[PDB]
């Protein structure tokens, strides 16, 4: 065949998004979890199966202890990551990686060891002709079809911010903020406890993740919505657990995403996500700032909450000069924007010479990641 | 396969109205008949009838009869189910997968189904592997032999060879028409087909799955019989990448860990009908690790592999221990006393031995003890090769006691157990590649190279058997046991006083010459190896007088006389004054026998030693056989009837010395000859093999300049075989440019009036039709080497004034008569109508009458799309070379549009398009064609091949590619076909404004620019693709 | 012969049930009694016999004193138990234990010594190639053809409750409730004295057991049935003693099985069978409650009364969330389900490698039961 296709995988924490390069959507999207039978089984003709990977672990949740292998964009456990990639290629996509070049995404300001060990596994585990590791935020920018913007990337791993102008990139102005979907989940199960609902274990920690994926929203003013929580009517929502227990969540619902704009609630000094965007834009040159204000791109899974775009717009407009208009461009489909940006990149004809070849790795070693790529 | 034209001739002669549309619904009905005797006779009617329809024009009705037999798989008469699977073994499921893609109503059929009509996974998972799990021992055996006949015929989707189902049928019909360690394992680099290793690894995936996930006794039991018949036709050592599953993760140990757990159970060995097939298959899977692992059991060298070999060598000494206590009525390392698991195996070898000794029947293949004792001395042999002296040194005591009792029942493979112990006790690709470009370049590369002692009780017992036996399978394994006691120098004390055994081999030469001996054929190659190897210690004077009797006074040569000298010549020429006289004797005998093509392999050995020993002697001997064989090739005495026979004679003229072939006086009087009578295809077939093998010499060994200076002196008239001379045989100032070109274009004319107009089973055989259409395959490779390589200057210009010319009043095969024969070659032989497409281009004969029938210029016949897509990859490569003629550029693009794009991964049509991007006026005509054919360019595979061809076109025609990128192709619902036409339309706007503003405005008109932006605002297309909309607003305001 | 078959013996208190593996129903069913002759006999030519076992004891009942050896799932004397196993093998079944693998059934939350001494008696008294001890409730689940369910198992032994989900088992959610059908027998003779029917010896104590297993039923609502017992009719029934004394019993008849749902009547704080079932389900994981509620399985000898399923369904439906539908599968034949579960289990090809062998016992001694099985 011509061009050989190519393979693209996004592994921020929480979800593997994977598929062929040259398509508009990934074939396989599943949770990045390795769930191990904690309870010793007593039957004959079970499994045994040392561990379960992917949405198999979601189905068989109650037995398992679940371990996310990626925390804060950092792989904690390498064998668990290899198992997840083994699951992507053989269980879903049914590809031999020898037949495809593979793009991986990776997060900004990330330890060198993750990029270098990630390449070491791609060549010396799944034999592969070529690969690339690319920055998450630039891929979302490509997916949005814009040449310029400040990309606010927040996954389940960590929050990142990369300003770009006309292509290029500003290394000093790149900001990484330790907040995530996962930290909002840990805050959320903590704020459910005051209501009497106690979720203590990994299995129902993913149940509050599912709650937060739909019920939670961001206030267009926090204090105003917290004041109208005195007359509870629309702010309460009934939620059904898989147990058949019913949960009723009021003001507790919208103050969980409020943590992004008030990290004093989590107990971290690190500024809210709108001030981090100001911190990135202020580090940029005076000239370009006009379009960075007007071309803010949201990406990732934890920018999905209803009303985030409006809240960021009101806060950035309030802080900034009202001399210029602050447009925020946050697409629906923004969850998959990194994977789509990886699809478009590996489909680019020129990019087919910028691959890290297997040959170039075999001569010059794993350290060449940083030398060739950003 | 011309059901159109042949039915017209009958109807005006005998006026019946009987088509084949009125007989297949008469054949579809008797398959659904009630009685189980009526259903046995209607499924042998589909053994004859569905290999002829499915490659014909009626292959709409031909696929339906494949479907209905699949419903006949579960009828309860055991003869109804085994004549199904023979009409599912003779199916070519690479030709069957091609019709599915063309169907749209047949996938629906009755009741309007949605989905694909998956014949292949339904006929392989739910019949053939399913009928392995039948209750009958008759139904389980016949289903294994089909998986020997199905694996070369599968075509699973998207290999890294054959891509389309069009390219799949084209590679099985081009191999047809265009050309001591033990038996288990291999040490070669093992050149193998990459795509034939993929079809054999999907039939061992679904077969190890109804052996592990099975719930019945009958699925485990008759699927160890289907794995032992793969490994004797598709061996594990040769096809190891198909058998590989796991173990050593890289030469493989495939799947051998499950089957040892079948044997160590106390259930599965208790029946000898399929415990003897699980021992021949566990020795094939521990021997394919021998090219890797070898550098207890110190020679295995892989400790994950030793428990698989410790078990079988423990399993095969406890089964020669139960066959020793059964042949001798004795009450019950190798020991089965204390095991209760193997006291069950002693009551099962004693039921099958009370029926042999009571019922006298000698000639039975299947005996289940005589079939079972054959299985466990074959695989005790193959393991000892892996063993050493140190592992067997505590067991040479053991294995020799059992065989003295195991000698009388089966001595044929109880010395194959003894032949091996003494070794290890003494140490020892896209339809342009396949049809033309891969076979065209094996042709020109072999032409540049043409320009260049506990045995002492057991050994004495085996010699008393050879004098008194009569079966000649046992007489052959005893002449190999004695050629190993002389190499490994056992002193000649087997016959301590007398010469008892050597006197008996001389008497057997009396019974072969007269003919009073039954099976001399399978012993005469091994009688003569024993005799020559003793004389290094009957001497070589006496050895060669015995071989002279058999030849002149005895039977024919290809069984007796020609295998008689393969031991002598290899052991006399390869390996003082006494040795000089005996080499003159052996070369004179073969000159009486040159006629046979097996005698010409023995004589390639003779010429390679004289080039090494003495180069003065090398040139004397190649002159003596120069004037013998070339008088034979004109009088056709040389048996070149096989394609094993033309391969031996062409490696002879390379190795024959070029001084004996340097005068071309001899090679031409042997060339330009007429046979006696060409009535019979025994005699037509040996005259056209004399012309193909002396023409491999006039191309390599001598150039074009030397050949044509001679024919001016030798009056070789071009009326030699003319249309007046060729007609009376079947019933019964000339240039040297002109003499040699009428001889090669009227010999294409003899081979094509036969294959069309001769019956297929009347006048010729089928083995004689493998080699009659294969002499037209290497004579059209000789004509495209003369017209292309350029060394043959005078021969190219001579054909162009002849194909343009008419025949001499009808005295020659004229060029419009020769081309009617070839279009009825379209369908029976589609690989050889791609070689006649490349000749007519090469002569300047681009005549649009013949080029439209082969390309169909404005279900399907499966054997024409190899030629329709094969003559359009070859008609572009003629346009790409001389692109100065614009008459051929504007024809092929306007007419063939849906074919020109859909081939764009091919090396001759990839080069046709880049020149169109180079040419100013030729690029503008390509874009008018797609706007007419947008109705077919909507399927997701046909639109990915347009953007790679509309990628970069001429800058003067980038204003017509931007009205096509917006009006037609951007509204596709495919969101990576709406994303990849955003990369190509933003790139046309950017190269235009850095270019001249003068030429671009006349290119993209000011009235035509306002039409485009009204399409994007009423629709949502501008707000979807932001990058396309920004670039067009800045265009207007500067202008 | 192939498989050698196997022997299956169920010996909860009150009834021995025994036969071959590969049958769907047993060959011998008889009461687990050892009956010794209390009164000295003055004749010549009698017996003598130390004791009568099984139904020889049922027949000659009045001379004897009758001892159950198994009380509350615990073997109280082991010569009496050995005689019951000696009797099953050599009188009805007529087999040598030397020929046959022997499966025995055993109770949830039972002292270790019952398993450890039981394996010793089977290995050292009746020489046997292999054996197994298996939990009663899992066997009754196998008999009812289910992979998932909550099993309420009760004999004249004790009441046990085991939740199961897709095989497995939850050890913390296994409940034992020391109420048996035997305690109902003692409750029945205690209530009968209100109507003047004094029964005092073991012989007529089994006459009230015989009354219990065919006149008694569970009230479909207790107060409603007790109120209509003011107007005696269908609520009273005549009964014939083997004496010829006629016995007429009324409200008495249904307030004996009521003690399972009201343990206050027998004087114990321990919650009812509906409440103990709820206690097990509350200990189980939140998700699996949905299918445990809809796959309640009843087995054993004292789950045989009319109205038990009907009542357990009213009382569990009243206590549980009515957002899901409580379904109880209480089949006929449920007295024998533990045995049927053993006959199927010993007929599984995979289970023939799970036996405790004689060699493993001889090598590693009595304690190995709790090192291979449950």
* Tokens 């009837």, residue located: B641
> Which helix (DSSP H) or strand (DSSP E) does residue B1023 occupy?
helix B1021-1024
Using omega within 30 degrees of 0 as the cis cutoff, is the peptide bond preceding A48 cis? yes
Q: B742 at the A interface (CB within 8 A)?
A: no
Contact at CB, B1026 and A146, closer than 8 angstroms: yes
List of chain A residues whose C-beta atoms are within 8 Å of the C-beta of residue B905:
1-2
Distance CA C357, CA C101 (A): 9
Q: Locate the chain B residue with the closest alpha carbon to A127.
A: B250
* The two three-digit tokens of residue B736, written as one number: 């040297």
Pairing of strands A102-106, A130-135: parallel
The CA distance from A61 to the nearest CA of chain C, in Å, is: 9
On whether any CB of chain A is under 8 Å from the CB of C282, the answer is no
DSSP letters along B486-512, please?
TTTT--S-TTSSS-TTTHHHHHTTHHH
Whose CA is closest to A260, among A200, A184, A189, A190? Answer: A184
Cα–Cα distances (Å) from B195 to B118, B239, B500, B763, C357, in that order, read: 21, 11, 57, 37, 52
Which of A37, A62, A65, A199 would you mutate first to test chain C, the one with the most C CBs within 10 A? A62
φ, ψ for residue C314, nearest 5 deg: -60, -45
Angle between helix A181-192 and A202-214 (nearest 10) = 100
Q: Please give the C-alpha separations between residue C74 and each of B449, B959, C54, C159, in angstroms, as whole numbers.
A: 95, 96, 19, 13
Is residue C68 within 8 Å of C36, Cβ to Cβ?
no
B111 CB within 8 Å of a chain A CB: no
Q: Is the peptide bond before C48 cis (omega within 30 degrees of 0)?
A: yes
User: From CA C321, how far away is CA C319, in angstroms rounded?
Assistant: 7
| Cβ pair A44:C323 closer than 8 A | no
With tokens 């004077």, the residue in question is B541
Helix runs in B255-347, H state only: 256-263, 272-275, 290-293, 306-315, 324-327
CB atoms within 10 A of CB B12: 7
Show the tokens assigned to B740: 């040699």
Long-range interactions of B216-223: CB distance < 8 A, separation 24+: B216/B133, B218/B133, B218/B134, B218/B135, B218/B140, B219/B132, B219/B133, B220/B262, B220/B268, B221/B140, B221/B268, B221/B271, B221/B274, B222/B132, B222/B133, B222/B134, B222/B137, B222/B140, B222/B141, B222/B143, B222/B274, B223/B129, B223/B132, B223/B133
Q: Are A334 and A343 within 8 A, CB to CB? A: no
Interatomic CA distance for residues A273 and A293, integer angstroms: 14
CB A63 within 8 A of CB A38: yes
CA nearest to B462, candidates B400, B414, B517, B519: B414
Phi, psi of B923 (to 5 degrees): -75, -30
- Residue whose C-alpha is closest to residue B873's, from B892, B853, B858: B892
Half-sphere exposure of B279 (CA within 13 A, CB side): 31
Helix (H, G, I), strand (E, B) or coil at C151: strand
C136-143 helix and C337-345 helix, angle to the nearest 10 degrees: 80
**Which chain A residues are closer than 8 Å to B979 by Cβ?**
24, 344
Which H or E run includes C280?
Answer: helix C273-283
**A112 CB-near residues (< 8 Å, 6+ apart):** A369, A370
Chains that touch A (3 or more CB pairs under 8 A): B, C
**H/E run at residue C132:** strand C130-135
Q: Distance (Å, rounded) from C-alpha A56 to C-alpha A87?
A: 11
Q: Is A55 exposed, middle or buried (0-12, 13-18, 19+ CB in 10 A)?
A: middle
From chain C residues 302-341, the ones with a CB under 8 A of any chain A CB are 321, 323-324
* Contact residues, chain B, for A344 at CB < 8 Å: 979
Burial class of residue B186 in the structure, from the number of CB atoms within 10 Å of its CB (0-12 exposed, 13-18 middle, 19+ buried): middle
Contact between C31 and C80 (Cβ < 8 Å): no
**Which residue blocks in chain A are alpha helix, DSSP H?**
55-59, 78-86, 112-124, 136-143, 181-192, 202-214, 222-228, 252-258, 273-283, 289-294, 308-319, 337-347, 358-364, 368-372
**Cβ atoms B50, B111 nearer than 8 A:** no
The data reach a resolution, in angstroms, of 10.1
Contact between B685 and B675 under an 8 Å Cβ cutoff? The reply is no
By the 8 A CB rule, do C173 and C280 touch?
A: yes
- Tokens representing B777? 């395959």
Instruction: Determine contact, residues B709/B687, Cβ cutoff 8 Å.
Output: no
Instruction: Give the whole-angstrom CA distance, residue B819 versus residue C34.
Output: 107
CB B283 within 8 A of CB B379: yes
| DSSP-derived pairing of the beta strands C34-36 and C52-53 | antiparallel
All partners of chain B with 3 or more CB pairs under 8 angstroms:
A
Residue B306 burial by Cβ neighbours in a 10 Å radius (0-12, 13-18, 19+): middle
Among the partner residues B948, B982, B1026, nearest to A2 by beta-carbon distance:
B948
Backbone phi and psi for residue A257, each to the nearest 5 degrees, phi listed first = -70, -20
Inter-axis angle of helices C273-283 and C308-319, nearest 10 = 50
Tokens of B945: 């091949």
Q: Which residue's entry shows tokens 């589609």?
A: B830
* B1038: number of Cβ within 10 Å: 7
Nearest one of A338, A354, A356 to A128, comparing CA atoms: A356
Which residues does A287 contact at the CB level (< 8 Å), separation at least 6?
none
> Please, where are the H alpha helices in B614-763?
615-621, 626-634, 645-648, 652-655, 665-669, 697-700, 704-708, 727-731, 736-739, 752-755
Determine contact, residues B773/B756, Cβ cutoff 8 Å: no
Helix (H, G, I), strand (E, B) or coil at B306: helix
Substitution target from A5, A95, A145 for chain B, most B beta carbons within 10 A: A145
Q: How far apart are CA B894 and CA B922, in angstroms?
A: 11
Strand partners, A103: A8, A132
The number of residues in chain C equals 374
- C-alpha dihedral sign at B818, B824, B826, B831: negative
CA atoms of B762 and B501, how far apart (whole Å) = 52
> Closest by alpha carbon to B656, among B596, B604, B590?
B604
Cα distance between residue B904 and residue B921, in whole Å: 21
Residue of chain C nearest A199, judged by CA positions: C286
Sorted by sequence, the CB contacts under 8 Å of residue C90 that are 6+ apart come out as none
Whether the CB-CB separation of C161 and C276 falls below 8 Å is answered with: yes
Transcribe B366-410 into DSSP letters: --SSTTTTTTTTTTTHHHHTT--HHHHTTTHHHHHHHHHHSTTT-
Structural tokens at position B750:
């003899």
- Among C169, C285, C289, the residue with its CB nearest the CB of A244 is C289
**Chain A residue closest in CA terms to C138:** A43
Interatomic CA distance for residues B106 and B907, integer angstroms: 35
Q: Quick one: fold of A135-180+270-331?
A: Nucleotidyltransferase; domain 5 (3.30.420)
Do the Cβ atoms of B545 and B498 come closer than 8 Å?
no
Element (H, E) at C273: helix C273-283
Partners of B970 on chain A (C-beta within 8 Å) are: none
Of A61, A62, A244, which has the smallest distance from its Cβ to C324's Cβ?
A244
CATH code of the domain occupying A34-67: 2.30.36.70
Task: Provide the greatest CA pair distance for chain C.
Answer: 73
Comparing CA positions, the residue from B311, B319, B310 lying closest to residue B372 is B319
Query: How many angstroms separate the most distant Cα atoms in chain B?
Result: 119
Say if residues B953 and B927 touch (Cβ distance below 8 Å): yes
Distances (CA, A) of A102 to A89, A300, B94, B330, C91: 11, 21, 32, 69, 75
Nearest to B418 by CA among B481, B479, B470: B481
Nearest chain A residue to B910 by CA: give it. A2
Chains with ≥3 CB–CB distances under 8 Å to C: A
Of A44, A46, A242, the CB nearest to C287: A242
- Which residue in chain A has the smallest CA separation from C345? A44
Retrieve residue B790's tokens.
């350029």
Q: Give the C window 88-147 contacts with A, CB below 8 Å.
A: none
Q: Kindly state whether A40 is in contact with chain C, defined as any CB-CB distance less than 8 angstroms.
A: no
Domain coordinates in residue numbering, chain C: 3-33+70-133+336-370, 34-67, 135-180+270-331, 181-266
Q: List chain A residues with CB under 8 Å of B980.
A: 22, 347
CA A341 to chain centre: 14
Say if residue B646 is exposed, middle or buried (CB neighbours under 10 Å; 0-12, 13-18, 19+): buried
CATH class of the structural domain A3-33+70-133+336-370: alpha beta
DSSP 8-state symbol, B126:
I
Distance from C-alpha of B382 to C-alpha of B777, rounded to nearest angstrom: 43
Q: Which helix (H) or strand (E) holds A152?
A: strand A149-154
Q: Which of chain C's residues have a Cβ under 8 Å away from the Cβ of A41?
A: 167-168
First-to-final CA distance of chain B: 65
Q: Which chain C residues in 343-372 lie under 8 Å from chain A, judged by CB atoms?
A: 350-351, 354
Structure tokens at A87: 């699951």
CB-based contact B254:B244 (threshold 8 Å): yes
> Alpha-carbon distance B873 to B164, whole Å?
15
Tell me the residues of chain C between 146 and 205 that have a Cβ less than 8 Å away from chain A. Answer: 167-169
CB C236 within 8 A of CB C143: no
- Residue B774 CB coordination number (10 Å): 17
How many whole angstroms separate alpha carbon A39 and alpha carbon C27? 39
Name the experimental technique. cryo-EM
Count how many Cα atoms sit within 13 Å of the Cα of residue B402 in the half-sphere of its side chain: 26
* Contact assignment for A243 to C287 by CB distance below 8 Å: yes
Partner residue facing A62 (CB), from C287, C321, C350? C287
Q: Extract the tokens encoding A344.
A: 């478009």
Q: Residues with Cβ < 8 Å from A182, sequence gap 6 or more? A: A13, A14, A68, A71, A156, A157
DSSP secondary structure code for residue A17 in this structure: E
Whether the Cβ atoms of residue B870 and residue B114 lie closer than 8 Å to each other: no
Which helix H or strand E contains C357, and what residues bound it? strand C356-357
| Whether C12 contacts C107, CB under 8 Å | yes
CB contact under 8 A, A146 and B905: no
Cβ contacts of A39 on chain C, cutoff 8 Å: 168
Of B406, B291, B296, nearest to B353 by C-alpha is: B406
Q: How far is A49 from chain C (nearest CA, A)?
A: 14
- How far from each other are the two terminal CA atoms of chain A, in whole angstroms? 30
Neighbours of B114 (CB within 10 A): 6
Tokens of A52: 């379960």
B1012 to B961, B977, B1009: CA distances (angstroms)? 13, 20, 6
Which C positions 207-236 lie with beta carbon below 8 A of chain A?
none
* Strand C130-135 relative to strand C102-106, pairing: parallel
Are C286 and A46 an interchain contact pair (Cβ–Cβ within 8 Å)?
no
Q: Residue B342 in contact with residue B318, Cβ under 8 Å? A: yes
Query: Taking each helix axis from N to C terminus, what angle separates C181-192 and C202-212, rounded to the nearest 10 degrees?
Result: 100
- Return the sign of the alpha-carbon dihedral for residues C78, C82, C85, C91: negative
Record: fold of C181-266: Actin; Chain A, domain 4 (3.90.640)
Domain pair C3-33+70-133+336-370 / C135-180+270-331, same fold? yes
Token pair for residue A323? 């001399």
Which one of C286, C350, C351 has the shortest CB-CB distance to A243? C286
Centroid of chain to Cα A255 = 21
Closest CA to B154 of B112, B190, B213, B205: B205
Which run of H or E residues covers position B7? helix B3-11
**Residue B355: how many CA atoms within 13 Å on its side-chain side?**
10
């Amino acid at each position: 065949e011509d061009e050989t296709t190519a393979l693209v995988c996004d592994n921020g924490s929480g979800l593997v998004k994977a598929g062929f390069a040259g398509d508009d959507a990934p074939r396989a999207v599943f949770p990045s979890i390795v769930g191990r039978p904690r309870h010793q089984g007593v039957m004959v003709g079970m499994g045994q199966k040392d561990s379960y990977v992917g949405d198999e672990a979601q189905s068989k949740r109650g037995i398992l202890t679940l371990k996310y292998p990626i925390e804060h964009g950092i792989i904690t456990n390498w064998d668990d990551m290899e198992k997840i990639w083994h699951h992507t290629f053989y269980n879903e996509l049914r590809v031999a990686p020898e037949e495809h070049p593979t793009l991986l995404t990776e997060a900004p300001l990330n330890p060198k060891a993750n990029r270098e060990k990630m390449t070491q596994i791609m060549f010396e585990t799944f034999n592969v002709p070529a690969m690339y590791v690319a920055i998450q935020a630039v891929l979302s920018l490509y997916a949005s079809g814009r040449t310029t913007g400040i990309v606010l990337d927040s996954g389940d791993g960590v929050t990142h911010n990369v300003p770009i102008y006309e292509g290029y990139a500003l290394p000093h102005a790149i900001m990484r903020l330790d907040l995530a979907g996962r930290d909002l989940t840990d805050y959320l199960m903590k704020i459910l406890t005051e209501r009497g609902y106690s979720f203590v274990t990994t299995a129902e920690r993913e149940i509050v993740r599912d709650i937060k994926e739909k019920l939670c929203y961001v206030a267009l003013d926090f204090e105003n919505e917290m004041a109208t929580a005195a007359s509870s009517s629309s702010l309460e929502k009934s939620y059904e657990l898989p147990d058949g227990q019913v949960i009723t969540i009021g003001n507790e619902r919208f103050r969980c995403p409020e943590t992004l704009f008030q990290p004093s609630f989590i107990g971290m000094e690190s500024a809210g996500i709108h001030e981090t965007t100001y911190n990135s834009i202020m580090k940029c040159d005076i000239d370009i700032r006009k379009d960075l204000y007007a071309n803010n791109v949201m990406s990732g899974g934890t920018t999905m909450y209803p009303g985030i775009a409006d809240r960021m717009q009101k806060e950035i407009t309030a802080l900034a000069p009202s001399t210029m208009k602050i447009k925020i461009i946050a697409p629906p489909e923004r969850k998959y924007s990194v994977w789509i940006g990886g699809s478009i990149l590996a489909s680019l004809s020129t990019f087919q010479q910028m691959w890290i070849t297997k040959q170039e790795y075999d001569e010059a070693g794993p350290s060449i990641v940083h030398r060739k790529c950003f | 396969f011309h059901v159109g034209d042949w039915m017209g001739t009958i109807r005006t002669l005998t006026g019946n109205t009987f088509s084949l549309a009125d007989c297949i619904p008469l054949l579809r009905k008797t398959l659904k008949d009630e009685s189980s005797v009526t259903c046995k006779l209607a499924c042998t009617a589909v053994r004859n009838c569905v290999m002829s329809l499915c490659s014909s024009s009626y292959s709409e009705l031909g696929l339906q009869l494949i479907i209905d037999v699949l419903t006949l798989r579960n009828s309860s008469y055991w003869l109804v189910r085994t004549e199904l699977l023979e009409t599912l073994a003779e199916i070519d499921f690479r030709l069957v997968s091609f019709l599915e893609a063309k169907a749209e109503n047949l996938h629906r059929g009755a009741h309007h189904y949605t989905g694909l009509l998956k014949l292949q996974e339904r006929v392989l998972n739910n019949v053939v592997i399913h009928l392995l799990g039948d209750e009958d021992p008759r139904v389980r055996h016949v289903a294994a032999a089909s998986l020997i006949r199905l694996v070369p015929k599968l075509f699973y989707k998207c290999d890294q060879g054959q891509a389309d189902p069009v390219v799949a049928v084209a590679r099985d019909q081009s191999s047809v028409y265009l050309k001591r360690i033990y038996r288990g394992y291999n040490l070669l680099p093992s050149i193998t087909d990459v795509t034939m290793e993929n079809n054999l690894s999907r039939v061992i995936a679904a077969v190890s799955h109804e052996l592990i996930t099975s719930t019945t006794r009958a699925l485990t039991f008759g699927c160890c019989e289907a794995l032992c018949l793969l490994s004797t036709a598709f061996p594990v050592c040769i096809w190891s990448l198909g058998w590989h599953c796991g173990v050593p993760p890289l030469c493989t140990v495939g799947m051998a860990t499950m089957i040892l757990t079948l044997l160590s159970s106390a259930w599965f060995p208790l029946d000898l009908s399929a415990h003897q097939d699980a021992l021949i298959l566990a020795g094939n899977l521990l021997a394919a690790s021998a090219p890797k692992s070898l550098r207890v059991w110190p020679a295995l060298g892989d400790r994950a592999l030793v428990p698989m070999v410790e078990q079988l060598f423990s399993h095969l000494l406890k089964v020669i221990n139960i066959c020793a206590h059964v042949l001798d009525d004795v009450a019950p390392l190798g020991s089965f006393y204390h095991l209760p698991s193997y006291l069950r195996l002693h009551d099962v070898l004693k039921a099958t031995h009370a029926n042999y000794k009571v019922t006298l029947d000698l000639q039975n293949s299947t005996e289940k003890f005589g079939g079972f004792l054959r299985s466990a001395l074959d695989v005790l042999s193959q393991i000892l090769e892996l063993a050493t002296l140190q592992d067997i040194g505590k067991c040479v005591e053991e294995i020799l006691g059992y065989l003295k009792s195991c000698f009388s029942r089966e001595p044929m493979m109880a010395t194959v157990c003894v032949q091996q112990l003494l070794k290890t006790l003494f140490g020892t690709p896209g339809l342009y590649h396949y049809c033309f470009m891969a076979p065209y370049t094996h042709f020109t590369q072999a032409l540049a190279d043409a320009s260049l002692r506990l045995f002492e009780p057991l050994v004495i017992k085996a010699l008393k058997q050879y004098t008194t036996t009569t079966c000649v399978q046992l007489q052959k394994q005893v002449l190999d046991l004695l050629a190993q006691l002389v190499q490994l120098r056992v002193n000649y004390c087997l016959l301590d006083s007398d010469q008892v055994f050597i006197g008996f081999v001389l008497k057997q030469f009396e019974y072969i010459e007269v003919g009073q001996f039954r099976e001399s054929e399978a012993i005469i190659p091994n009688i003569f190896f024993f005799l020559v190897l003793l004389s290094y210690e009957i001497g070589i004077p006496k050895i060669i007088q015995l071989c002279d009797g058999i030849m002149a006074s005895g039977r024919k040569a290809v069984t007796h006389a020609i295998p008689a000298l393969q031991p002598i010549v290899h052991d006399l020429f390869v390996l003082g004054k006494e040795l000089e006289t005996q080499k003159e004797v052996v070369v004179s005998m073969l000159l009486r026998l040159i006629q046979y093509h097996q005698v010409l392999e023995m004589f390639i050995l003779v010429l390679q030693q004289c080039h090494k020993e003495n180069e003065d002697k090398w040139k004397r001997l190649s002159r003596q056989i120069a004037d013998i064989i070339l008088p034979m090739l004109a009088k056709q005495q040389m048996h070149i009837d096989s394609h094993e026979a033309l391969g031996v004679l062409n490696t002879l003229f390379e190795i024959l010395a070029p001084s004996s072939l340097r005068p071309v006086d001899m090679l031409l009087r042997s060339m330009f000859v007429t046979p006696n009578t060409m009535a019979s295809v025994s005699t037509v077939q040996l005259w056209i093999s004399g012309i193909l093998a002396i023409l491999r010499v006039l191309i390599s060994q001598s150039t074009e300049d030397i050949v044509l200076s001679r024919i001016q002196e030798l009056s070789f008239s071009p009326y030699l075989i003319s249309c007046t001379v060729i007609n009376r045989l079947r019933d019964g100032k000339n240039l040297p440019e002109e003499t040699f070109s009428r001889f090669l274009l009227q010999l294409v004319g003899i081979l094509l009036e036969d294959i069309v107009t001769k019956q297929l089973k009347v006048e010729m055989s089928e083995q004689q039709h493998t080699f009659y259409c294969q002499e037209l395959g290497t004579l059209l490779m000789c004509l495209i080497h003369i017209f292309k390589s350029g060394m043959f200057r005078r021969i190219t210009a001579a054909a162009t004034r002849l194909f343009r010319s008419d025949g001499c009043g009808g005295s020659f095969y004229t060029l419009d008569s020769l081309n009617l024969r070839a279009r009825s070659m379209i369908t029976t032989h589609p690989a050889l109508v791609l070689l006649w497409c490349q000749i007519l281009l090469l002569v300047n004969h681009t005549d649009y009458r013949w080029w439209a029938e082969v390309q169909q210029t404005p279900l399907g016949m499966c054997n024409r799309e190899i030629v329709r897509r094969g003559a359009l990859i070859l008609f572009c490569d003629y346009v790409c070379q001389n692109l100065h003629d614009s008459e051929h550029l504007t024809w092929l693009i306007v007419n063939h549009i849906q074919d020109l794009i859909s081939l764009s991964h091919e090396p001759p049509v990839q080069d046709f398009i880049s020149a169109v991007h180079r040419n100013s006026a030729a690029s503008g005509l390509f874009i008018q064609a797609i706007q007419s054919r947008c109705e077919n360019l909507s399927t997701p595979t046909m639109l990915k091949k347009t953007l790679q061809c509309l990628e970069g076109i001429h800058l003067s025609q980038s204003g017509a590619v931007l009205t096509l990128y917006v009006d037609r192709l951007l509204c596709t619902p495919f969101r990576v076909l709406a994303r990849m036409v955003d990369i190509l339309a933003c790139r046309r706007v950017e190269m235009l404004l850095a270019a001249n503003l003068q030429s671009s405005m006349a290119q993209l008109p000011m009235e035509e620019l306002n039409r485009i932006q009204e399409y994007l605002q009423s629709s949502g297309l501008a707000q979807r693709h932001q990058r396309l909309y920004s670039l067009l607003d800045r265009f207007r305001l500067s202008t």
